[PDB]
Amino acid sequence: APRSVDWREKGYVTPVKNQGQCGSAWAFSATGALEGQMFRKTGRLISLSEQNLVDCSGPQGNEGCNGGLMDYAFQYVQDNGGLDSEESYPYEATEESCKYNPKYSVANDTGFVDIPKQEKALMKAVATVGPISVAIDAGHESFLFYKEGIYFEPDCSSEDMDHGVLVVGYGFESTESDNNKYWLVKNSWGEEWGMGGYVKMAKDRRNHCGIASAASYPTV
Numbered sequence: 233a234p235r236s237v238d239w240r241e242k243g244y245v246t247p248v249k250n251q252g253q254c255g256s257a258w259a260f261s262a263t264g265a266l267e268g269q270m271f272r273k274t275g276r277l278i279s280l281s282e283q284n285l286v287d288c289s290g291p292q293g294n295e296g297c298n299g300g301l302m303d304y305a306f307q308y309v310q311d312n313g314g315l316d317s318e319e320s321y322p323y324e325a326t327e328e329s330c331k332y333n334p335k336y337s338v339a340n341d342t343g344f345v346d347i348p349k350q351e352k353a354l355m356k357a358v359a360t361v362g363p364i365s366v367a368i369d370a371g372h373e374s375f376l377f378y379k380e381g382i383y384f385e386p387d388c389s390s391e392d393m394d395h396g397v398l399v400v401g402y403g404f405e406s407t408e409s410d411n412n413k414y415w416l417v418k419n420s421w422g423e424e425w426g427m428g429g430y431v432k433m434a435k436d437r438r439n440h441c442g443i444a445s446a447a448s449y450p451t452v
């Protein structure tokens with residue numbers, strides 16, 4: 233029910249990462265949600281290998297630096313029966329042959345769940361579960377240049393999303409608020425982008441940028 237949530241303060245979230253020049257955001261969104269649920273489970277925050285996902289999760293539907301889905305990622309961790317740590321399987325920003333090594337697994341998952349397409353459900357799910365993997369229309373130059381404040385983009389689509397990110401919670405602006413409410417969104421473009429890597433994004437403004445059209449998370 234909370235009028236504010238920040239999972240970064242409860243220890244759920246790793247420091248901002250950078251996918252570099254590789255369409256692997258689906259993989260940073262996925263590890264982000266898996267890092268969170270692994271923490272809820274064990275009380276241990278261990279950073280997870282995106283390269284593992286990029287290299288190995290093709291059989292689940294993912295296409296490396298050419299793109300992918302978070303759901304596919306969670307499916308691979310299940311099928312595979314583990315995922316390697318960031319330390320053991322470092323990120324390289326390019327597609328290589330699979331080097332997974334069951335000895336270095338530090339996370340598991342058991343399925344995933346998809347939140348229905350409602351900023352109400354997505355409010356619930358943040359509050360209940362953990363950080364949530366979501367997809368957004370990021371394909372505007374205002375998103376490139378974003379520095380601070382609450383992101384709103386008139387030409388944003390709620391149906392055509394192109395970029396996976398992580399909702400680590402939500403707030404509001406103005407000691408009150410209809411307005412101005414924001415989602416708290418961790419990106420994977422390095423800390424130099426946005427607000428040290430994060431972005432506040434319009435919440436309950438008609439599913440802005442489709443932040444709720446494709447939400448999900450891993451069961452553990």
Ligand SMILES: *[C@@H]1O[C@H](CO)[C@@H](O)[C@H](O)[C@H]1NC(C)=O
Binds near residue numbers: 313314
């Ligand atoms: C993941 O789960 C499988 C089967 O439940 C188990 O064999 C494996 O040891 C687990 N790995 C970790 C790192 O928890």
